[PDB]
């Protein structure tokens, strides 16, 4: 099996804007998670060819990773902060769907998700 193409990160047909919530998601939320000890399995799409996981994209039909989210923020792909929060939540849910309790990658996801939730509790005010 091939890997699927990664998620779209730029779309010329979508309107663009900057907002303080989007700035905060990139320059505070994403940045904090990106540097975390446990972030590396989440920094790029799962390469199921290289890792020989041919069932990964038979189970996970909405793949997402922080590399894609970073590119989406940097390309102004999101209009609403909740779109970006939704992608982080998809990334974590995909981990819990594919993996078992007790697995290392689940412990890693749980720690990142805890930190993610703490950081988005401090999202600044909407315009």
Ligand X SMILES: CCN(CC)S(=O)(=O)c1ccc(O)c(NC(=O)c2[nH]c(C)c3c2CCCCC3=O)c1
Residues of this chain that interact with ligand X (CB under 6 A) are 41-42, 46-47, 50-51, 56, 95, 98-99, 105
| 38 or 79: CB nearest ligand X | 38
User: Minimum distance from CB of 96 to ligand X (Å)?
Assistant: 9
Residue least distant from ligand X (Cβ): 41
Tokens of 85: 């929060």
Select 85 or 112, whichever has its Cβ closest to ligand X. 112
Choice between 97 and 117, CB closer to ligand X: 97
**Nearest Cα to Cα of residue 105 among 61, 58, 51:** 51
Least gap, CB of 95 to ligand X (angstroms): 5
Instruction: With CA atoms as reference, report the closest residue to 42 among 119, 117, 107.
Output: 107
Nearest CB to ligand X, comparing residues 79 and 98? 98
Q: What is the DSSP string of 42-85?
A: GSS---TTTTT-TTHHHH-SS---HHHHHHHHHTT--SSHHHHH
């Amino acid at each position: 099996s091939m890997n699927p193409p990664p998620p779209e990160t730029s779309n010329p047909n979508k309107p663009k804007r900057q907002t303080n919530q989007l700035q905060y998601l990139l320059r505070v939320v994403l940045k904090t998670l990106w540097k975390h000890q446990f972030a590396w399995p989440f920094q790029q799409p799962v390469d199921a060819v290289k890792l020989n996981l041919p069932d990964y994209y038979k189970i996970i039909k909405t793949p997402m990773d922080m590399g894609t989210i970073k590119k989406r923020l940097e390309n102004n792909y999101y209009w609403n902060a909740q779109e970006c929060i939704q992608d982080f939540n998809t990334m974590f849910t995909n981990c819990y769907i594919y993996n078992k309790p007790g697995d290392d990658i689940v412990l890693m996801a749980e720690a990142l998700e805890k930190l993610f939730l703490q950081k988005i509790n401090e999202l600044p005010t909407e315009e």
